[PDB]
Design a protein around this nucleic acid. Structure first.
Ligand SMILES: [Zn+2]
Ligand SMILES: [Zn+2]
Lengths: 42, 390
RNA sequence: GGUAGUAGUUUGUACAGUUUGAGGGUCUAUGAUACAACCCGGUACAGGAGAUAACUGUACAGGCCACUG
């Protein structure tokens, strides 16, 4: 129901997530430069 | 790349730091915990460590310590109220010179024994001699005798009289202590050679520093409240609490007590002072330096001294890191003397072979001591009626 | 007298992982549909890694019962 904390993927949760930590991505614009709360075009 | 830091940024809020370079003892591990002292190898392992019960149980204690550090400075009125409160507490429950004179008037019991035994070994010892408690440590008269005679037979013969007379009540003899003892509350333990050498120093400090007695008295009363004073059933030796205070005064930025050794010495080698030996006081002067008053008097409000002591033993330094010693003002590591790290390390100047305090091995008792120290610090520092004192 | 070690049986803490009972949504919804499958969805999220008890072996501090080089 919620995106993975480590990878931002609904496929698996953080506990099940096995891939190494990677830069966060803004869901609204799919950009790692900024987060969702700081999206310029939102 | 840059975002990876954000992933560990959360961990930075739980005092989790990635190792700058690989550690030889844990080559695989790449992380460390400031509070838990445990190495980790992966970020998932770090998050699991965050979920550990002990990690949060220590994080809450760290937060409480930070809150204590941020307490506002005391006001002059609060300081004066606290000082008068400590003075009242010390004077109400303090053995005065009259009580010591009454106790001395030991002489009658010595006269009684001398009739039975031509050579009688009786000498006043304990709280009354030091005036540092009220029948708390080494209550009444704890005797010392030379080793040239045989202590067991002496103990038997002397206890024979105290058991013989029916006037006395509840007279027994216990040999379970480090030295044989007889209770009638009298204490007869022949063979002591160093205890008197230490009570000599404690008595010497009684009038050399007027604030020494009230501070040690307040510490003893607080320990009695907390039950830490009792050597039996764990805790910390009762009399060594006084030595504990002597450590604070000696390690205080403005010292109130001269150093026993190192104040005047030739060929000082701080690597090991085992060879150096001390002797009895000489007219309240520095202890024997062959092989105790400051040049300028120090007088400060007792409340300030109490607050500084509480900060020293609660918020200043880690108790396990260093040993409590009075021989040298320089701080000494515990591993240098090969002493254990589980038991609180307290060292009396005249004997360094073994730790005087070995009843605090249980970590539960140490945690109780630490939490009581924190509670006392917050109770006293925070403003309250009558200076926040009992 | 000092260092170190020593069969089980005991000591208090922490603990890879393995199993009950309590946990968190529930209101945001038309309809289906003998025991013949599937469901429209305005009114949801923030930067957040999510539980207590009986077993399983374990680094620590001294001993039971006292011993050994
Ligand atoms: Zn994932
Ligand atoms: Zn965006």
């Amino acid at each position: 129901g919620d995106r993975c904390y480590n990878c931002g993927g609904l496929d698996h949760h953080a506990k099940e997530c096995k891939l190494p930590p990677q830069p966060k991505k803004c869901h609204f614009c799919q950009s790692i430069s900024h987060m969702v709360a700081s999206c310029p075009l939102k | 790349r840059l975002g990876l830091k954000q992933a560990e940024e959360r961990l930075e809020r739980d005092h989790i730091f990635r190792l700058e370079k690989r550690s030889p003892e844990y080559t695989n591990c790449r992380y460390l915990c400031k509070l838990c002292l445990i190495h980790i190898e992966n970020i998932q392992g770090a998050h699991k460590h965050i979920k550990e019960k002990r990690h949060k149980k220590n994080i809450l204690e760290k937060q409480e310590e930070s809150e204590l550090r941020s307490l506002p400075p005391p006001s002059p009125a609060h300081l004066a109220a606290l000082s008068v409160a400590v003075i009242e507490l010390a004077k109400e429950h303090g053995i005065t010179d009259d009580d010591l004179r009454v106790r001395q008037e030991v002489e009658e019991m010595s006269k009684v024994i001398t009739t039975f035994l031509p050579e009688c070994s009786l000498r006043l010892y304990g709280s009354s001699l030091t005036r540092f408690a009220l029948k708390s440590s080494d209550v009444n008269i704890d005797i010392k005798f030379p080793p040239k005679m045989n202590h067991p037979d002496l103990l038997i013969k002397v206890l024979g009289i105290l058991k013989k007379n029916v006037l006395y009540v509840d007279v027994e003899s216990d040999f379970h202590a480090k030295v044989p003892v007889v209770v009638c509350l009298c204490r007869v333990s022949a063979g002591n050679d160093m205890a008197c050498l230490t009570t000599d120093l404690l008595t010497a400090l009684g009038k050399i520093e007027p604030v020494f007695i009230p501070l040690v008295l307040a510490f003893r009363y607080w320990a009695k409240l907390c039950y830490i004073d009792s050597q039996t059933d764990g805790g910390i030796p009762s009399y060594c609490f006084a030595l504990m205070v002597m450590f604070f005064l000696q390690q205080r930025k403005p010292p109130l007590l001269p150093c026993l050794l190192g104040s005047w010495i030739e060929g000082f080698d701080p690597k090991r002072m085992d060879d150096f030996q001390l002797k009895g006081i000489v007219e309240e002067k520095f202890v024997k330096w062959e092989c105790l008053a400051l040049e300028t008097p120090n007088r400060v409000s007792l409340g300030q001294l109490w607050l500084e002591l509480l900060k020293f033993y609660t918020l200043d330094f880690a108790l396990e890191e260093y040993v409590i010693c009075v021989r040298i003002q320089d701080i000494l590591t515990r591993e240098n003397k090969n002493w254990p790290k589980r038991r609180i390390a307290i060292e009396d100047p005249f004997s360094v072979k073994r730790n005087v305090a070995r009843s605090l091995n249980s970590q539960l008792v140490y945690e109780y001591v630490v939490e009581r120290f924190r509670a006392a610090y917050r109770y006293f520092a925070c403003p309250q009626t009558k200076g926040g004192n009992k």
